[PDB]
Amino acid sequence: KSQINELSYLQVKGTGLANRCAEVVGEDSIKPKPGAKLVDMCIEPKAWAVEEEVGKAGKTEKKFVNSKVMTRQTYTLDAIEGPITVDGGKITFNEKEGIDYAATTVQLPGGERVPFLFTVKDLVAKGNGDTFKPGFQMGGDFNTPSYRTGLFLDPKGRGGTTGYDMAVALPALQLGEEGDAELFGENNKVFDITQGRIEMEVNKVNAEDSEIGGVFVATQLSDTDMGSKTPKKVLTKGIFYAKVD
Amino acid sequence: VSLWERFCAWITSTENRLYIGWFGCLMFPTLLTATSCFIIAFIAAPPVDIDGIREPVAGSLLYGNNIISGAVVPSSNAIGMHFYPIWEAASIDEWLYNGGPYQLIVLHFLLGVSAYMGREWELSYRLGMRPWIFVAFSAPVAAASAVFLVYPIGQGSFSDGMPLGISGTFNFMLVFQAEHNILMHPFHMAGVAGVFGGSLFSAMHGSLVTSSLIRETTENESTNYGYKFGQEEETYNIVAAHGYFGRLIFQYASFNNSRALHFFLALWPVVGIWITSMGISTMAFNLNGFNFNQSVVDSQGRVINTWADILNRANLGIEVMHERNAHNFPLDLA
Amino acid sequence: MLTLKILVYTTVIFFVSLFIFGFLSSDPSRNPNRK
Amino acid sequence: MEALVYTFLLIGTLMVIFFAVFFRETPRIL
Amino acid sequence: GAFHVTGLFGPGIWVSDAYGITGKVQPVAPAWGADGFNPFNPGGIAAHHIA
Amino acid sequence: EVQFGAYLAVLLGTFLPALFLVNLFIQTEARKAGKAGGQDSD
Amino acid sequence: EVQFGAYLAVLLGTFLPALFLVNLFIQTEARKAGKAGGQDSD
Amino acid sequence: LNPMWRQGMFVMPFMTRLGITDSWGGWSITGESVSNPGIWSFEGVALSHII
Amino acid sequence: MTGPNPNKQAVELNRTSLYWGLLLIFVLAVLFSSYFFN
Amino acid sequence: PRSWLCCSHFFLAFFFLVGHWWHSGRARAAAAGFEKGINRANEPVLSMRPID
Amino acid sequence: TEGTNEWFGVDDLRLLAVLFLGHWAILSLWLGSYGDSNEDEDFFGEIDYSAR
Amino acid sequence: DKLAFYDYIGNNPAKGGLFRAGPMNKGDGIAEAWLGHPIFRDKEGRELTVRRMPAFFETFPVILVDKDGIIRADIPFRRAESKYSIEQVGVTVDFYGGKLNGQTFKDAPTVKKFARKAQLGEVFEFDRTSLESDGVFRSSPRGWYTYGHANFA
Amino acid sequence: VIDYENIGYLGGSSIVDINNANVRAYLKMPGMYPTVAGKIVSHGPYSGVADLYKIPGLSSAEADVIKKYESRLTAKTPSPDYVIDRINNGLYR
Ligand code: CLA
Ligand code: CLA
Ligand code: CLA
Ligand code: CLA
Ligand SMILES: CC(C)=CCC/C(C)=C/CC/C(C)=C/CC/C(C)=C/CC/C(C)=C/CC/C(C)=C/CC/C(C)=C/CC/C(C)=C/CC/C(C)=C/CC1=CC(=O)C(C)=C(C)C1=O
Ligand SMILES: CCCCCCCCCCCCCCCC(=O)OC[C@H](COP(=O)(O)OC[C@@H](O)CO)OC(=O)CCCCCCCCCCCCCCC
Ligand SMILES: CC1=C(/C=C/C(C)=C/C=C/C(C)=C/C=C/C=C(C)/C=C/C=C(C)/C=C/C2=C(C)CCCC2(C)C)C(C)(C)CCC1
Ligand code: OEX
Ligand SMILES: [Fe+2]
Question: Disulfide connectivity (chain A) (predicted)?
């Protein structure tokens, strides 16, 4: 807000305030200009859910169980820039820069730890109408990069762009015509790009201050450690905030 | 008569089985909580992000370890030096992920060991003893506070603190070699001389007493039964063991005084471990050991290798491999 | 988590106060020499 | 199945420490 | 029987349906009649330990 | 995968020598109760 | 394929009860040598 | 399709009979998730019969 | 402590009853091994 | 010069904590009379309970 | 909120009433014997053996 | 096949460990046949010999050396700034004798698989499913006899 | 990847890749580090050497040093793990 901007740095630190997106006040309309460029879009999710096999009364249909985040306060995106292009039918947004990834890890019932990169990279938003309204609702696809960049070294010392490529303390595996092709999947490290679909919804606007904010819902796919396991579908919900300029 | 005087009379009574004392008022609650959390965290504790890079390192027995590899993992690099109790963690699952129980065990350990040390003073006061057994115990208290407290302070994180385990100890010693060169530092040199000397004068004093024992048994029963407990006769000819060592090296190198002899056994190790534990302390603040790399040159100016250059190439191997993902910039400032 | 936290400050300053008021309880006079 | 042996060795070691402290052969003069 | 089972001061007994599909821990009110000696009636267990 | 002959190594490496050292203590206390002549010698 | 917990069943089912019955015999002979008072009582 | 009586659990159906469904891992035998079971879970009962 | 217990007795096992109890365990070990190994 | 001050005044500050341990062990025992050793005529342990 | 600069880690008001009732509950025990004594009785010793 | 079987690092008694147990066939399995003698040639055509593992090294980087000692090819740890990779040098493998008698593999996926197993002496086909062979070398009875009777003495 | 083709075009073959090389690989070409090499590495996937002239913000001098080494520049398939660490891959002399 501007109320957050009143504070100094020593009053914010250690209080968990910089993690939290602003609260926009009031509702009206604002029109995106021709050269309109979005300035301070922050996204913070308030709840997480992982698609699992749930234990109902007699059936095992797939449902979302929620989860507790374990990385502490590092989940919020910030400073996301981008120009707001005006197509004729629908106003669009394409993000350009800003902190658009925040790696985090949630824990399921059972003790399973599921990390996932929460990101909005290469987002193509499209929403009904032209002007931002309390009934406005935009969304679109984003590309999730892999959770580890290819020069990550696993405990044996094997990466996609560096490291070894065989079980380094098992030297008798590469004997014979077959070699170590039985454990081939854990040697080949494949950088993976998946898709994610976010759906935002503006409901409170200032036009005298040119800042909007509302509730979103985002679904994406968790990580796999370069093909080590099957990734799992992760749903999340929260609130965002943006400065329309 | 009062309730407090009848409680001070019990808590300072030497007639208890174990003397409790006023230091036991904060020795026993501290060390039983360091114990009861250690047994649970060593047996059943989920993996811990130590490098702060969200790569959790398993350290307990239920997650596929043994006595050697299993270890209570230090806290995260993300926390660092911050105090991280259970109530400042928003769940226990968030506490156990980020290296929770390393701070609960260590801080209740260093309070309980510094209270076990003062408890050794207290009973020496109530028994009429001269007081200074607790000064000899200052030497492992100096060394325990050096690797769990002082070295995480000067390096700015408990993640550089020592892992509570057996294989975690040798992860600690080797990474400390590459980054600080402890073997060339003269305070590890002054305590290797403290424990090689300490184990020498232990087995040198323990042999000269056992050599000069007086006949009090038969050849059928044990040698040890010639000492009745609480007797007032001396159980070995001390003139005999003085004349032996007075000929084994020469005459003037032998302590005829048994009090000055039994003082030198307490001096040499304890001074050797005071000095050593202030080697880790001065190397906690990056005042490393000696560095004689590229010190010998010819007249042309080409570097002639020494043994320190071969030792350097062993340090360069551990330096480029410790925390192989945690670094992003060319110099390990931490 | 603020219920556990209350329980710890009870237990700490219970035993810390037994320590503080232990040595204020004429503690040098508790020796085997006299009294 | 493997860690069950390690736990039994550890708490079994702490038993004989308990019996050595409290059930010790108390030495007596005369 | 009065507190743990009947859920006055307790969780209660695991009960279930006739065919083992649904089942949950719930308080069980006692059945005092001759239906209490039907052993598949969980109310007879509450009526037993109270009586 | 662990070696299944190690259970026999450890659990007999514990029990067989440790049950041996118990026996030398029980017959030690029996000889002391044997000579003593009161209520336990028989 | 045999059950690898059966080695622990048999070899402790032999040794632990059979080493028990040895101990009751050794302390029996120690009490008899304890009372007898000659060369072995101590 | 994998209840506790397939996995050979012997004393575990005696804890769930008298009203214990949750565990400290967060799972439950009824399948509903739980944030906190408190003290009396499966691990709390097992650790208290030891103490 | 308190006083010495007047109910202290001694345990006996003669050489005869040793061989019964040894042979009892080995024959039960011969018999039940084949079933345990399955 | 930070690493010279944090490694030398820190170096001394442990040995002066040892000076608190030496000089107060002696001073508390010099006040009580047994800093020279145990009396042979009157040993305090012998006038106590059985040991257990 | 960890790195707040709050006295003794007292975050909430409820934790004070824990601290005051801990020092005072043993202080009142201590005053039952060493309190209500003569505050004007001296000695020229190194150590006082006055009373209980 | 017997003469090439001694030219194999798994038959060295200085490769085993202490607390690993059992025969050497527990190491990698019962040997079946000799795969042959691979000869490595680059795109220039000169003969490259794989540098062999000494008895000290548990791990050893695969290095291909020509006749005069110059490093000509390897398998790089760091794949970014690579100047001697097999893809650049274009090393082809030629077998001679054994069951791979006249064969030539030319692509980098297959040549790297035979360059790793050629630093271990000769190249054999094993049978690791009969004794549940885990994949680490054991010691010969020459090694065990020297252990006991020198720790005894 | 175990078996990645075009290892040579990254840094050492003296014919560089565009969409996979490190910015250190353009150091061997006099004139391009850091300014002209900074723009090539920063923008997205290229399909040819002709797409090097499509960079927003080129001078005639920035197109000049590309014109010199356009035989040595070539473009390959972007494998997405090399495309991330194009500014910094953690290699320092
Ligand atoms: C009595 C011994 C004892 C001691 C010293 C400690 C000490 C500690 N415990 Mg522990 N604990 C104990 C017993 C003890 N514990 C027991 C019995 C249990 C089981 C219930 C626990 C369970 C437990 C848990 C579960 C946790 C701790 C934690 C802690 C740490 C912080 C707790 C805190 O806020 O302290 C409160 C301290 C104060 C308010 C300060 C009191 C100091 C007084 C005021 C003296 C100062 C004098 C003053 C300066 C004079 C001024 C004069 C004026 C004129 C200037 C600390 C190391 C936490 C931890 O280590 O996390 C990392 C944690 O999570 N403890
Ligand atoms: C010949 C080889 C050799 C020798 C003899 C030594 C000797 C020593 N090294 Mg060294 N070192 C060597 C090679 C060697 N080094 C090499 C090659 C390296 C490089 C890898 C190092 C790296 C190195 C490091 C990094 C450190 C040492 C340290 C030490 C000292 C260890 C003493 C110690 O910590 O006890 C002191 C005792 C304790 C720490 C224990 C305290 C225990 C408390 C009091 C109680 C615990 C009670 C317990 C929990 C329960 C009790 C039982 C219970 C049942 C009641 C000693 C001087 C340490 C040092 O400098 O001192 C700190 C140290 O940190 N060395
Ligand atoms: C409000 C009144 C009330 C109610 C509703 C109940 C309800 C019940 N009582 Mg209870 N009871 C009550 C009052 C009440 N009690 C009072 C006041 C007493 C006196 C203290 C008892 C004493 C009592 C006993 C002693 C028993 C019951 C039992 C039962 C259960 C009967 C159904 C069943 O499974 O039995 C099944 C019926 C039997 C098991 C019959 C027992 C006959 C035995 C088994 C014959 C065989 C004996 C022989 C040694 C076995 C070896 C031979 C072999 C060859 C077969 C049921 C829960 C029974 C129970 O708990 O079982 C779960 C039981 O055994 N009650
Ligand atoms: C000089 C003695 C000696 C030597 C060199 C060998 C050598 C060999 N034996 Mg052999 N054996 C011996 C004596 C010896 N045996 C005796 C006396 C017995 C009768 C018990 C056996 C029974 C035996 C069997 C049943 C088998 C062998 C096998 C083998 C082969 C592999 C063994 C192996 O991997 O070691 C394993 C390594 C170790 C055991 C470590 C050595 C001991 C370490 C150092 C610990 C020392 C003890 C320690 C201090 C005490 C801990 C106590 C604690 C647990 C309480 C090898 C050729 C195996 C084989 O392949 O045969 C076909 C096999 O199946 N042996
Ligand atoms: C004529 C020709 C042909 C020409 C050639 C010239 C020529 C002849 C040359 C030859 C000369 C030649 C070299 C001879 C010299 C001989 C010589 C010295 C050779 C040896 C070489 C050598 C390097 C020796 C030095 C090493 C040496 C022995 C060092 C001694 C170390 C030392 C002083 C240790 C003391 C440690 C110490 C204080 C121990 C006491 C503490 C201790 C706990 C002891 C226990 C103990 C002690 C007691 O006291 C008593 C009472 C009891 C109870 C007791 O527990
Ligand atoms: C968890 C801990 C596990 C605990 C296990 C430890 C206890 C295990 C061992 C105890 C039982 C010991 C039995 C001792 C046996 C014993 O000592 O016998 C002697 C005993 C009584 O003898 P007396 O009364 O003469 O004893 C005089 C005393 O001085 C000594 O007992 O006899 C019996 O109790 C009944 C006879 C059983 C004798 C066995 C008869 C069957 C013969 C064997 C059959 C096998 C051959 C079959 C051929 C087909
Ligand atoms: C191996 C095996 C197994 C296992 C088993 C087990 C686990 C066992 C255990 C067991 C046990 C573990 C047992 C125990 C018992 C014990 C007892 C029997 C004891 C007794 C005691 C006593 C004797 C006491 C004494 C005393 C004291 C101490 C003090 C006081 C006095 C008195 C006297 C009281 C199984 C089968 C599963 C499977 C197969 C194999
Ligand atoms: O955390 Mn544990 O190790 Ca002491 O250096 Mn810097 O930080 Mn990390 O790296 Mn290297
Ligand atoms: Fe001595």
Answer: 21-42
Give residue numbers after which chain E breaks (C–N above 2.5 Å): none
Which atom of ligand 7 has the smallest separation from the CA of F11?
Answer: 1
DSSP β-ladder status, A124-128 and A138-144:
antiparallel
Residue B248 Cβ inside 6 Å of ligand 2? The answer reads no
Query: What SS3 state is found at E37?
Result: helix
* Token pair 């800042």: residue: A211
Three-state DSSP at K24 gives helix
> How would DSSP label each residue in B168-232?
HHHHHHHHHHHHH--TTSHHHHHHHHHHHHHHHHHHHHHHHHHHTB---S-SSS-GGGG--TT--
Residues of M in contact with L112 (CB under 8 A): 2-3
Secondary structure string (H, E, C) spanning chain A: CCHHHHCCHHHHCCCCCCCCCCCCCCCCCECCCCCCEEEEEEEEEEEEEEEEECCCCCCCCEEEEECEECCCCCCCEEEEEEECCECCCEEEEECCCCECEEEEEEECCCCCEEEEEEECCCCEEEEEECCECCCCCEEEEEEECCCCCCCCCCCCCECCCCEECCCCCCCCCCCCCCCCHHHHHHCCCCCCCEEEEEEEEEEEEECCCCEEEEEEEEEEECCCCCCCCCCCEEEEEEEEEEECC
Q: Please give the number of the atom of ligand 2 that sits closest to the Cα of B144.
A: 39
User: Which among I12, I13, I15, I17 is the best mutation to test ligand 6's pocket, defined by most ligand atoms within 8 Å of the CB?
Assistant: I17
Quickly count: other Cβ atoms within 10 Å of residue B8's Cβ.
Answer: 24
**Separation of B21 CA from ligand 8 center, angstroms?**
41
Cα–Cα distance measured from residue G29 to residue G31, given in angstroms and rounded to the nearest whole number: 5
What is d(CA B242, CA I28) in angstroms, rounded to the nearest whole number? 64
Distance B275 CA to ligand 5 centre (A): 27
Ligand nearest to the CA of B253: 5
The experimental technique behind this entry is cryo-EM
Compute CA distances B7 → B16, B22, B232, C25, K47, whole Å: 13, 11, 37, 11, 22
CA angle A8, A14, A19 (to 5 degrees): 85
What is the helix, strand, coil percentage profile of chain L, to 5? 25, 20, 50
For C34, which residue in chain K has the nearest alpha carbon? K49
Do I6 and F41 make contact, defined as CB atoms within 8 angstroms? no
Angle between helices B138-145 and B100-126 (to 10 degrees): 170
Burial class (CB in 10 A: 0-12, 13-18, 19+), A89: exposed
Q: Do B97 and A153 touch (CB under 8 A)?
A: no
At how many Å resolution was this determined? Answer: 3.6
For B324, the closest of A70, A71, A153 (CB atoms) is A153
- Interaxial angle between packed helices B100-126 and B28-43, expressed in degrees from 0 to 180 and rounded to the nearest 10: 150
- Please give the backbone phi and psi of residue K29, each rounded to the nearest 5 degrees, phi first: -65, -40
Residues with C-beta less than 6 Å from any ligand 3 atom: E 32, 36-37, 39, 44-45, 47-48, 51
Q: Which atom of ligand 4 is nearest to the CA of L21?
A: 34
Chain F residues in contact with L132 by the CB 8 A cut-off are 1
Nearest to H27 among A60, A66, A110 (CB): A110
R_g of chain K computed on alpha carbons: 19
Ligand nearest the Cα atom of residue I22: 6
CB-based contact, B64 to chain M, within 8 Å: no
B57 CB less than 6 Å from ligand 8? Answer: no
Which string of DSSP letters, residue by residue, matches H1-51? Answer: ---TTTTT-SSHHHHTTTT--B-TTS-BSS----S---S-SHHHHHHHHH-
Instruction: Report d(CA A39, CA D8) in Å as an integer.
Output: 62
Provide the token pair at M68: 């010199």
Nearest-10 Cα torsion for L42, L47, L48, L52: 160
